[PDB]
Specification:
Chain C: Its main location: host cell. Chain C: GO terms for molecular function: host cell surface receptor binding. Chain C: It is found in: Host apical cell membrane; Virion membrane. The structure holds 3 chains of a larger assembly. By secondary structure, chain A is an alpha+beta fold. Chain A has seven helices and 36 strands. In chain A, the strands form twelve sheets. In chain A, strands 9, 10, 14, 17, 20, 22 and 23 form a seven-stranded mixed beta sheet that branches. In chain A, α4 runs antiparallel to α5. Chain A has two domains: 236 residues, Hemagglutinin Ectodomain, Chain B (Alpha-Beta Complex), CATH 3.90.20; 212 residues, Hemagglutinin (Ha1 Chain), Chain: A, domain 1, CATH 3.90.209.20. In chain A, a hairpin with a 2-residue loop joins β26 and β27. Chains in contact: A-B, A-C, B-C. The complex binds a molecule of 2 linked components (NAG-NAG) (3 copies) and 2-acetamido-2-deoxy-beta-D-glucopyranose (18 copies). The site of one 2-acetamido-2-deoxy-beta-D-glucopyranose (NAG) has 3 residues of chain C, from loops.
């Protein structure tokens, strides 16, 4: 006729996604991305990190060098994987402050061991046990030297070794606690006092405790594992009258990106930075709900099973009408656009610049959230198999506090960002609407349903000029004014 | 007259509330709710949590079986409330890691004790002390067995108890430290000794220390309390030559929701999810400022004394003027509405759909904040009476860090939620204004004071349609245009 | 011309600052302020906190009374500064929980020492060492009494010291660990033994461990340092057969604002609340990147080297365009303003009320961020010279968690405040535009670039009336309608 209808609107999808916001908990959007990694590959990836498979060994067993760990001598790792099927198959032993030695070795990142010419004069070296079978013969820990009497004599040892290198030396040693007095006399030829291992900086004094223990692998005795770190310029001094499980040398202490993880997952052929006890995970998402123990460039752990970030706007599912009444399910070329009813027929076109502006802002948001990872290697233990008390309670409290704070941050971030995304895309729809209103000047009226009523004959070329920003309102001003106001 | 005025606006109150926002610290709102629970009932509510009243007992005193704790034997609790007037009136004891045992048992949640038939031979059982009286006779702890010599001999005990059940067993035992050597010879007929309690996984060795102590209840001697946890399939082996305060059995270890709290509040008939040492508190508010220690489904502790969440718009108290100039004290039916001037007279009506939309958004926000609590059962100690050093400093650092972070989160959350509340209620007022503008089309002009001047004769029927919606601008369009655009 | 052009706009600068927002991490603004203190003065200000310069003394050496530390006796501090050049010149010693004793003394805030009439009968007092030279004489720690023996006898000392005052008493004592049995007999006349120090509530029992150790200052023996806290109403019993490095009295324990810091910076004659190991820092900014170790009213430590807070608007660089197309680089009188073209000529003026409203809201934000810092005195150790185990790992984990969470909060806060500031100044431009539209009513049209076309004669008096809100649309309505329509 003499008028045309130009409706502005946006696309819609048949099946949207439900996201959370500040105003609402369940708002439907056209599209959303998962920000919580809730699955793993089931396998640990061996690249870029050097992964040392513990097999039947724990890290401490590999440190001491019991027979099943012979293949772990002088090895390095980025992450040591300890299996729950791992077991000791050697002399029974314990480590006072086990967790500290395990953390120290895990953070050292190597079992590189240099033998030293210790002056073990007057004692018999290389003691053996039936509990440690190396190659069908009795043996002992490969990195320890079980000293016993020589010719029924064990003289008081005072053996020193300067640290003349530029690095710290880690010495692993222990105390043998025999089952009975007959074993103390049989092995050391005398009752024992104390063993003192010292440096200039510090000293450790320990005592044997002769007495029966419940048998593990048919041995009623125990070895207690102790360690010392010797700084450059410092001197190790071992003062012992018996019951000394001597070092054969030193381990290297290194600073680095190494740690230890407990996992039953197989190790595959891969390239994945983030390792969890359930296997490696992608680190594209900013958060994860796989596990709380992590290694490498990992997402933050949260308790939410899902957090969906709106990478799109509110769906608003289902004459012509604009964005105020409904979204358009028939629009697939873009996010925002125009639909019109003209004397030449009905039609539709996408507005690609507003679509790209909204997409660019969403891409900015994703670039701020996606791809930014938390690269962490050595942390505290987060699952415990024994109840010790105050220290474990504090470690659990710290981890629970961290998880509650990061879960709060993730929930607030997702709700604020989703509210921002809806306000952003409604804002972009409004910028296109005000731009069209300003371009049309007095030649059209807002009908209140997201559409403009154009009061002049506006053909397809006219509509196209409006869509791409080249509409000249002066050409049609008299016709539209004469039609709006009955001159 | 030939024209009418329709002013849009919002309600106001004589006395508002001062809240914080992003750009304004002292912004007045019509209504706000307190988000910090800063008061308590002064009593601990005994439901739904099972609460065991310590009376004159500590949890440890109840654990060993102090004469004042006969009412605690084999009992369960969800929260043990330890009293500051509690004291021991039995043999004085020293638990070398008191906090760990107190926490371990508090989280275990029961004093269930099975009297296992320990094979004590060659010794005298059921030793008593004059400092621990039951029914006017000398007694001892009911869960400990003080072993002494029999016929002036104390043979070396070697007593084995395998763990043949499916749960862990907690054995509590100790070492007697007499005040002098005469006491040790009188009780044990041994100059000294060593006590070793072993499992397959770990061992504890303790030595008695003969010497004087300050007399507590006239006793110059001490009992050192130790505990062993025996896993299923593990074995308890006790080896002693003297000074053994023997176990009478085991306590059960359970994973659960139990804990210990220090408080002096009375216990009475009530119902409250969250327990605080100042008495139980309502858990409706998201935050609290009562005490650092909590139990159950509680709000999170912050340093803020008050944080008020706006549950209404900005209060701007003060011809007809609208939301641009002031708020309306005479609007009592709703939050948003209309006032009009026509030839019939002046009037006012509330717009209930905009009011309900704003209320629904606020109620959604309240559902996000109010009623959502965090269940916290066993945590670290958060108040200390003794100066311990590094571990206490770390616990204080962790708790103050948590509180500082949650106080920041509370301040940012309240400022963001109040800024959003103001923006949302101003947005709803602006949406009603734009909606009215759209219905009026060319039949009205914005007066710049929140009011529309309607340029057709408009008397109580057109105003009704405008308030309802679906106002027909076409019928009045020629009259309004003749009044607006004629010279 | 029968019309006039009235354009609205905002100022711009030739060179702006790059800030981060929620949806744009490289957005240029007219002005910004640094919220991360990234540099120190290099000196530790001696005011308002009382600071003791350790020089060659550690806190433990000051506690025990090392001969070089005589100047620290009975002194008080709000912050003790331990130097990396510090070393001992007395008997070698080992504190089995060094960090805990150092924390107790640092938090007590004083070395006020009170001598007590201990009954050290039957033994010789005031033992000396060649490693502790005080006045060119052999000496010992001034707060410890090295008891050896009297006439080749060491009767078992059973010494009681009641606490009859209202404060906790800190007693520092030790155990000598000689390098050989001959030294044990020479000093104490009898071998082995043990030392028990106890109160009503607690007890500590230790044993000497005779044996050679690596020589420090040509001495192969060690003194172990132990301590006990005696509450009011309690009694301290020291029971020793030998090897006792006895107390001479007690140290007072106070609750307060004292702590210890490791630093090599000199002490300056200045005033600053926040002290870091690199020296004092200003405490105006909400965050810092100088050090993790803090004392006083400090900002929070973050991982960011810089965080810039927009204190301005978008710097949109460039007949009259308006705010939608670009900013106005020629504006010096304000942030928001007007430009016009009329029958007399072109001109420009600032709108000071919109400018002040935007500035007042920005100052509100600055008042919430700047000047609000957090006073902390005694915290965990955050740097370590040796690796100890799970406790050090936990302390590092806790501090790193705090830093990551505050760094997250700092980035979220800066991005939200900068996005709000941009929305704020865009909103103020929009309220000024809408306000102008409302005064003009139907006498002007929005031409789409931030300008209004006014369809009536509007001289400089008219433009001024529009600027200050006195414009009356009724008097110009017939001319503007005749020119605007037909
Ligand atoms: C203390 O008791 C334990 C167990 O009751 C004894 O250990 C047992 O020794 C026998 C010796 O033939 C072994 O067959 C068992 O397997 C051992 N069991 C356990 C649990 O260790 C131990 O020998 C006893 N000690 C003394 C000195 O009599
Ligand atoms: C070591 O000295 C203490 C002094 O405290 C003696 O303990 C006091 O003994 C008397 C009499 O037995 C009591 O009246 C006091 O109450 C005790 N003191 C305290 C603080 O309780 C202790 O007897 C002495 N030891 C020896 C072996 O003589
Ligand atoms: C234990 O061995 C150490 C190491 O040789 C002895 O200490 C040395 O003693 C000589 C004696 O003049 C000194 O010159 C050295 O400087 C000492 N070296 C160190 C590292 O301390 C120590 O004397 C020996 N102890 C016994 C009892 O034989
Ligand atoms: C959602 O976005 C992703 C990534 O851009 C795209 O692959 C997917 O097809 C989108 N889905 C819908 C329904 O728009
Ligand atoms: C680990 O031990 C099991 C038996 O427990 C054995 O079958 C397996 O071969 C061992 N694996 C390696 C790598 O030695
Ligand atoms: C002990 O065994 C080690 C194995 O490396 C060997 O080098 C050393 O010579 C042996 N010493 C004695 C005394 O058998
Ligand atoms: C362990 O029991 C045996 C039994 O003969 C005894 O000789 C030994 O001294 C005991 N050890 C301890 C530490 O009690
Ligand atoms: C240390 O070695 C010396 C060497 O003479 C000896 O006399 C002393 O008994 C030893 N001490 C210990 C605890 O081994
Ligand atoms: C990962 O393993 C832990 C082991 O306790 C389990 O609780 C968790 O559900 C697992 N997660 C996934 C995604 O497999
Ligand atoms: C805009 O569209 C019209 C009609 O389709 C066309 O004539 C004109 O060249 C277009 N201009 C631009 C800049 O794309
Ligand atoms: C504030 O809201 C509460 C309901 O939560 C209502 O009871 C109270 O009357 C309101 N007060 C004002 C001043 O609006
Ligand atoms: C606790 O002590 C008070 C002291 O007055 C006494 O009345 C009460 O009976 C005691 N209760 C128990 C359980 O010992
Ligand atoms: C020791 O006392 C307990 C009390 O329960 C009793 O059952 C046990 O038979 C007594 N044993 C002896 C040897 O008196
Ligand atoms: C609750 O009790 C604690 C006890 O330390 C006290 O510090 C706090 O002020 C009390 N709070 C209230 C609200 O009574
Ligand atoms: C419109 O509002 C008026 C208010 O006076 C009311 O009387 C009338 O029933 C309403 N009509 C409809 C259709 O809502
Ligand atoms: C930025 O603001 C500061 C005051 O905070 C002022 O001194 C400085 O001149 C301003 N710079 C610019 C370019 O506006
Ligand atoms: C610190 O020690 C050095 C090296 O012995 C000495 O030169 C200096 O004078 C000492 N300073 C003080 C204050 O004791
Ligand atoms: C020991 O030295 C102190 C000075 O610190 C002195 O007061 C005391 O009288 C001396 N005692 C003896 C027994 O010489
Ligand atoms: C405790 O004091 C008495 C008092 O003579 C003494 O006999 C005993 O040996 C002392 N014990 C210790 C460990 O000092
Ligand atoms: C402060 O000192 C620490 C430790 O020496 C150093 O890592 C840091 O870079 C220093 N910072 C500044 C701003 O000097
Ligand atoms: C506004 O500006 C005009 C400029 O002509 C002046 O005459 C008038 O007095 C001013 N009014 C106010 C309130 O500043």
């Amino acid at each position: 006729n003499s008028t045309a209808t130009l409706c502005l609107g946006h696309h819609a999808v048949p099946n949207g996604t439900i996201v959370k916001t500040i105003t609402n908990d369940q708002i439907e959007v056209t599209n959303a991305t998962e920000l919580v990694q809730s699955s793993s590959t089931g396998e640990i990836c061996d690249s870029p990190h050097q992964i040392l498979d513990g097999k039947n060994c724990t890290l401490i067993d590999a440190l001491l060098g019991d027979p099943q760990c012979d293949g772990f001598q002088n090895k390095k790792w980025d992450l040591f994987v300890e299996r729950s099927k791992a077991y000791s198959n050697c002399f029974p032993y314990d480590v006072p402050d086990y967790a500290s030695l395990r953390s120290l070795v895990a953070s050292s990142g190597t079992l590189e061991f240099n033998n030293e010419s210790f002056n073990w004069t007057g004692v018999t070296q290389n003691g053996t046990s039936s509990a440690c079978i190396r190659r069908s013969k009795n043996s002992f820990f490969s990195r320890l030297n079980w000293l016993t009497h020589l010719n029924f004599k064990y003289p008081a040892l005072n053996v020193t070794m300067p640290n003349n290198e530029q690095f710290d030396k880690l010495y692993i040693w222990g105390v043998h606690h025999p089952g009975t007095d007959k074993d103390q006399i049989f092995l050391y030829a005398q009752a024992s006092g104390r063993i003192t291992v010292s440096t200039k900086r510090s000293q450790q004094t320990v005592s044997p405790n002769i007495g029966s223990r419940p048998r593990v692998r048919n041995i009623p005795s125990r070895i207690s594992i102790y360690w010392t770190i010797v700084k450059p310029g410092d001197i190790l001094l071992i003062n012992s009258t018996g019951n000394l499980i001597a070092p054969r040398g030193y381990f290297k202490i290194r600073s680095g990106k190494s740690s230890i993880m407990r996992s039953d997952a197989p190790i595959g052929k891969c390239n994945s930075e983030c390792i969890t006890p359930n296997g490696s995970i992608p680190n594209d998402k900013p958060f994860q709900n796989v596990n709380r123990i992590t290694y490498g460039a990992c997402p933050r752990y949260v308790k939410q099973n899902t957090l969906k970030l709106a990478t799109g706007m509110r769906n608003v599912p289902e004459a012509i009408a604009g964005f105020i009444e409904n979204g358009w399910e028939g629009m697939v070329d873009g996010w925002y656009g125009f639909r019109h009813q003209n004397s030449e027929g009905r039609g539709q076109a996408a507005d690609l610049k507003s679509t790209q502006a909204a997409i660019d802002q969403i891409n900015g948001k994703l670039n701020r959230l996606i791809g930014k990872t938390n690269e962490k290697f050595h942390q505290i233990e987060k699952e415990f198999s024994e109840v010790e008390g105050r220290i474990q309670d504090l470690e659990k409290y710290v981890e629970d506090t961290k998880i509650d704070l990061w879960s709060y941050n993730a929930e607030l971030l997702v709700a604020l960002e989703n509210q921002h995304t809806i306000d952003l895309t409604d804002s972009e729809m409004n910028k296109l609407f005000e731009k069209t209103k300003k371009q049309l000047r007095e030649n059209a009226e807002d009908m209140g349903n997201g559409c403009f009523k154009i009061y002049h004959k506006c053909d397809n070329a006219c509509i196209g000029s409006i869509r791409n920003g080249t509409y000249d309102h002066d050409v049609y001003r008299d016709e539209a004014l004469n039609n709006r106001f009955q001159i």
